[PDB]
Amino acid sequence: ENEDVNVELSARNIPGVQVTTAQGLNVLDITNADSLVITEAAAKKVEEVLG
């Protein structure tokens, strides 16, 4: 949704994985990925700010 330093630090060192905020989404790191896991809150946030 906004920021989780713990999950960011957990996923930082894995290859292929990237971590982003709903506000900080970008087309490049969306399209480079093959899958997209969201939290429900982040999904609702992007839904409201893009709808």
Partner RNA sequence: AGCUGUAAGUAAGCUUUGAUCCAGAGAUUUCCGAAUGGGGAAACCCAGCAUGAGUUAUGUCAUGUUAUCGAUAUGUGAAUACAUAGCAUAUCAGAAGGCACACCCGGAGAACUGAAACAUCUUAGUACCCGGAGGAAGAGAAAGAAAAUUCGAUUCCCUUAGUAGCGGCGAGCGAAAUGGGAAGAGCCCAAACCAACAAGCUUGCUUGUUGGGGUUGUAGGACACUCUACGGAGUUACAAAGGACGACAUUAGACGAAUCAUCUGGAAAGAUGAAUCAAAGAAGGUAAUAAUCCUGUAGUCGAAAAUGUUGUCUCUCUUGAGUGGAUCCUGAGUACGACGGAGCACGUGAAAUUCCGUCGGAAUCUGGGAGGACCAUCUCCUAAGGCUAAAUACUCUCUAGUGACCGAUAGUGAACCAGUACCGUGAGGGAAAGGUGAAAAGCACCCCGGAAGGGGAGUGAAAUAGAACCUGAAACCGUGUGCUUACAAGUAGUCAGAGCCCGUUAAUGGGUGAUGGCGUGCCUUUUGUAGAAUGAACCGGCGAGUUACGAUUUGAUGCAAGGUU
Partner RNA sequence: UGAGGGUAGCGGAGAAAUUCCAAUCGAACCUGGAGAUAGCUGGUUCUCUCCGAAAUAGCUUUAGGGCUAGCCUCAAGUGAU
Partner RNA sequence: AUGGUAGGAGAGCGUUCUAAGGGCGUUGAAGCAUGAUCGUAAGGACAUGUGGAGCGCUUAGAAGUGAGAAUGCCGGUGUGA
Partner RNA sequence: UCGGUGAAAUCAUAGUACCUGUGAAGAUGCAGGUUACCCGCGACAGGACGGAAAGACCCCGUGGAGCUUUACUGUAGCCUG
Least distance from C-beta 40 to RNA, angstroms? 25
Q: Does 23 bind RNA (CB under 7 A)?
A: no
Whole-angstrom distance, CA of residue 51 vs CA of residue 35: 22
Backbone φ/ψ region at 16: left (φ over 0), alpha (ψ -120 to 50), beta = left
Which of 15, 27, 37, 48 touches RNA by CB under 7 A? Answer: 15
Q: Does 10 bind RNA (CB under 7 A)?
A: yes
Binding interface with RNA (CB under 7 A): 9-10, 12-15, 32
